[PDB]
């Protein structure tokens, strides 16, 4: 699948892709952590 953007962008941005993937994985795990904490809080709230 071709892209119209210049390869001058692509060659450099290849490097930032790996770091962005690393950031995205950590952010996803982070958000899952808040989800778990918040659903535990919701369970407690429903009990009370």
Tell me about this structure.
The chain has 48 residues and is mainly α. Helix content is 85%, strand content 0%. The chain contains one helix and no strands. It has one helix spanning 7-47.
Write the layout of secondary structure elements.
Layout: H1 7-47
Distance between the termini: 55 Å
Based on secondary structure, the structural category is mainly alpha
SS summary, helix count? 1
How large a portion of the residues is in β-strands, by DSSP E? under 5%
Largest sheet: none
The ordered H/E elements are H
Task: Describe the global form.
Answer: rod-shaped
Binned, the helix content reads over 70%
Number of strands: 0
Radius of gyration: 19 Å
Family: Belongs to the SMC family. RAD50 subfamily.
Protein name: DNA repair protein RAD50
Subcellular location: Nucleus; Chromosome
Subunit structure: Component of the MRN complex composed of two heterodimers RAD50 and MRE11 associated with a single NBS1.
């Amino acid at each position: 699948e071709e892209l119209p953007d210049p390869d001058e962008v692509l060659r450099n941005t290849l490097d930032e892709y790996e770091q962005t993937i690393n950031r995205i994985v950590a952010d996803r795990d982070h958000k899952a952590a808040q989800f778990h904490d918040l659903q535990a809080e919701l369970k407690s709230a429903r009990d009370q």
